Amino acid sequence: SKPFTVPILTVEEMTNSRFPIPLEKLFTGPSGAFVVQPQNGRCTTDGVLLGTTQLSPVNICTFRGDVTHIAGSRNYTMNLASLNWNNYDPTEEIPAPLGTPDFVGKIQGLLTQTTKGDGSTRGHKATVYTGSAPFTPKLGSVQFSTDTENDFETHQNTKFTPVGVIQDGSTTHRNEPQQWVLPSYSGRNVHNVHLAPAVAPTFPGEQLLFFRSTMPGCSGYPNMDLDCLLPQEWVQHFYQEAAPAQSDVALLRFVNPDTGRVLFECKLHKSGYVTVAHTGQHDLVIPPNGYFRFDSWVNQFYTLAPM
C-alpha cells in the first residue's frame, strides 16, 4: 500500500482550515462542555473531504453570486453561485456550499463587484451574520449588511472576501463569535444535514489537540480564538496522496530537527482529528522548527505518553 505521510511543515508555516489565516500555536483543552463539530477542515487521512471542506485556503468563508437590495437599504441579499461561478446545486449532499463559515458569528470583509460590460468595479465593507435568520447558504442565499455609497448593481458577479470578526462592544466582552456553534445552514426551524460528525476524546488522559489561530477583529471585543482539527495543508496533503489508512489511528511524533528529540506523541485519527495525552488547558511550548512525523499505524491498545 502507498505509504502514509503528513507534511513536514512547521505550525507557523501552515494555514487554519476554518478561516483564511495562518496557524500560530497548538492548544489542548477539555471539550466536554461543548460540541466540537466543525465542518471546514474535515478530511480523512486517506483523502476523503467531509462537511463543507474544500481544498483552497483562500476560498474559506468566501461567498460568490449576484446581489439584490430593496431601494434605500444597506442590506444586500446574495444569490449564491459555486466556487467557480457556476450554478449552486442545493441537492448535493453537503451541509452547505463548500467553504461556508461553520461558526455562529459576525464576519466582516469586503464585498466587491465587477460590471461585466465595461469592467467598472466597486467595493464596500460588509458583514454577514451567520447566526441570523437570513443566513441560509444551504438554500442558496445569505444577507450582507453595508454602509453603502455606490449601490451594487443587479446581475453582476459579486464576491465577499472575509477579513475578520466583530462583537457588539456594548455587550459582555468575547461573547461572540461562538466557534463551536454551527449555524443553521437552512435557516430557522430546519435541521442541518450531511454533517461531518462531532469529535471527542474517548480514552482516559486524552484531549483533543487543536491547531489555533487568532482571528483579526474589526470592531468591539470579539473572541478571536479559532481552533481547527487539521491544518489546511494537511487536508490538501491527504486529498492528494490518498494513502490507504492501515488502522483507525496514526501515531505522530512531534520532533525538534535541531536536537532530534521528540517533544510529544499524538494520535491522528483516520477520521481527521488529533488527540494527545493531557488533562487541562494548555498552550503547547514548541521549538520554531518543530514538525510532525508519522511513525506507525497503531490502535486502541497503544497508550500515548503524557505530553
Epitope: 500500500s1 505509504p3 502514509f4 492501515q246 488502522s247 501515531l251 506523541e265 495525552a277 508519522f294 511513525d295 506507525s296 499505524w297 497503531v298 490502535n299 491498545f301 497503544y302 497508550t303 500515548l304 505518553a305 503524557p306
Partner: nanobody
C-alpha cells in the same frame, strides 16, 4: 510471527499477591504495546494493564493502585505485579502484544493464558 512466553499465576488467598511475566520473540517491531487481558468463563475479556513503547501505560479502573505493569528488565519482556488480590480478580490472564509499523496494519499476538484464582 510473534511468540509470547507467559510465566506465573496460580492460587492465592485474598489480599495476596502474584507476579506475571511475558516475553516476546520473533518478528517484533520497535513500536508496540504489550500487556494483559483477563477473561473469566461466561464473561467477555477485559483489559488489565498495558504498556506502550513510547512509555504510556493503561490500567483498568478495577486494578488501579493494585497492579503495576513494567518493561524495564529483560529484553522484550513485561511484568505485571498484582497486589492486594480480590476474589473478583479470578480469571485467565493472557498476555497480548500489538506490533506496529508505518506500512501495514497492526499485528496482534496473544499467549495461551494462565489461570489466576483468588479464594478462601
Amino acid at each position: 510471527d510473534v511468540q509470547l512466553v507467559e510465566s506465573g499465576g496460580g492460587l492465592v488467598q485474598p489480599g495476596g499477591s502474584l507476579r506475571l511475566s511475558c516475553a516476546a520473540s520473533g518478528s517484533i517491531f520497535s513500536i508496540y504495546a504489550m500487556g494483559w487481558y483477563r477473561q473469566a468463563p461466561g464473561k467477555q475479556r477485559e483489559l488489565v494493564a498495558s504498556i506502550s513503547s513510547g512509555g504510556g501505560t493503561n490500567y483498568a479502573d478495577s486494578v488501579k493502585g493494585r497492579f503495576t505493569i513494567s518493561g524495564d528488565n529483560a529484553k522484550n519482556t513485561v511484568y505485571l505485579q498484582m497486589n492486594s488480590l480480590k476474589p473478583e480478580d479470578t480469571a485467565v490472564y493472557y498476555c497480548k502484544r500489538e506490533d506496529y509499523s508505518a506500512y501495514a496494519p497492526p499485528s496482534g499476538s496473544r499467549g495461551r493464558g494462565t489461570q489466576v484464582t483468588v479464594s478462601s
